[PDB]
């Protein structure tokens, strides 16, 4: 795909299988460390075990932007007033990955490689900044200046607001208090051009996304 464009996310939890009932039940998704969730019979995400390995981790979904050269951008990243946060490494022979921090400290990943659009499909990330200008000029020097403006988006939000980047699944209006019955919390709403979006916080904790259409 392009530059900059939304292309993988994967959720990190110490309870995996309560989050597979979770995801299961909110958007139907069918399913070793990790998880493999499908819909329509293709890929949606993955699933994996916090506590599968040591050392200190962040749970939560990770969101992955395409890029064509993961040691470019490696090399673009701290001239640009970010941070190499892990990479750039071969994943077997699917690509080469980095983690990348932003100027204002958000994790992002970038995948160079070697996606329905129904209800429960990954439609997009987007990145929630109070630094809506100073982000965006770092994401423009790695991506061009069309980038936010699959499409990834920039929100400017107040520093109330969650913040960082989530991973966006479309649904229906209907999934809001379904969510809330199994245990969310909602932390968010706003408009986007293609409908409102709800920020949740799932049971576990893990933050996402509901487009809702």
């Given at each position: 795909?392009?530059?900059?464009?939304?292309?993988?996310?994967?959720?990190?939890?110490?309870?995996?299988?309560?989050?597979?009932?979770?995801?299961?039940?909110?958007?139907?998704?069918?399913?070793?460390?990790?998880?493999?969730?499908?819909?329509?019979?293709?890929?949606?995400?993955?699933?994996?075990?916090?506590?599968?390995?040591?050392?200190?981790?962040?749970?939560?979904?990770?969101?992955?932007?395409?890029?064509?050269?993961?040691?470019?951008?490696?090399?673009?990243?701290?001239?640009?007033?970010?941070?190499?946060?892990?990479?750039?490494?071969?994943?077997?022979?699917?690509?080469?990955?980095?983690?990348?921090?932003?100027?204002?400290?958000?994790?992002?990943?970038?995948?160079?490689?070697?996606?329905?659009?129904?209800?429960?499909?990954?439609?997009?990330?987007?990145?929630?900044?109070?630094?809506?200008?100073?982000?965006?000029?770092?994401?423009?020097?790695?991506?061009?200046?069309?980038?936010?403006?699959?499409?990834?988006?920039?929100?400017?939000?107040?520093?109330?607001?969650?913040?960082?980047?989530?991973?966006?699944?479309?649904?229906?209006?209907?999934?809001?208090?379904?969510?809330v019955m199994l245990g969310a919390s909602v932390l968010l709403r706003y408009?986007?051009?293609?409908?409102?979006?709800?920020?949740?916080?799932?049971?576990?904790?893990?933050?996402?996304?509901?487009?809702?259409?």
């Open positions: 795909p392009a530059p900059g464009e939304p292309t993988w996310v994967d959720l990190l939890t110490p309870d995996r299988g309560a989050a597979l009932q979770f995801y299961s039940a909110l958007f139907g998704w069918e399913f070793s460390p990790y998880t493999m969730c499908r819909l329509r019979g293709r890929e949606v995400c993955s699933i994996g075990d916090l506590g599968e390995n040591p050392g200190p981790a962040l749970g939560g979904w990770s969101s992955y932007l395409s890029v064509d050269d993961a040691d470019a951008a490696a090399a673009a990243v701290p001239e640009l007033g970010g941070a190499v946060l892990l990479g750039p490494i071969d994943i077997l022979a699917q690509g080469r990955m980095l983690l990348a921090g932003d100027p204002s400290g958000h994790r992002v990943g970038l995948w160079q490689a070697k996606p329905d659009d129904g209800i429960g499909a990954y439609t997009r990330s987007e990145l929630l900044t109070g630094a809506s200008a100073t982000d965006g000029a770092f994401y423009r020097g790695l991506f061009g200046a069309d980038f936010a403006t699959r499409r990834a988006a920039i929100r400017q939000v107040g520093p109330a607001a969650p913040s960082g980047w989530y991973p966006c699944f479309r649904a229906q209006e209907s999934a809001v208090p379904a969510a408009d986007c051009p293609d409908g409102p979006a709800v920020v949740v916080s799932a049971p576990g904790g893990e933050v996402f996304t509901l487009l809702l259409t």
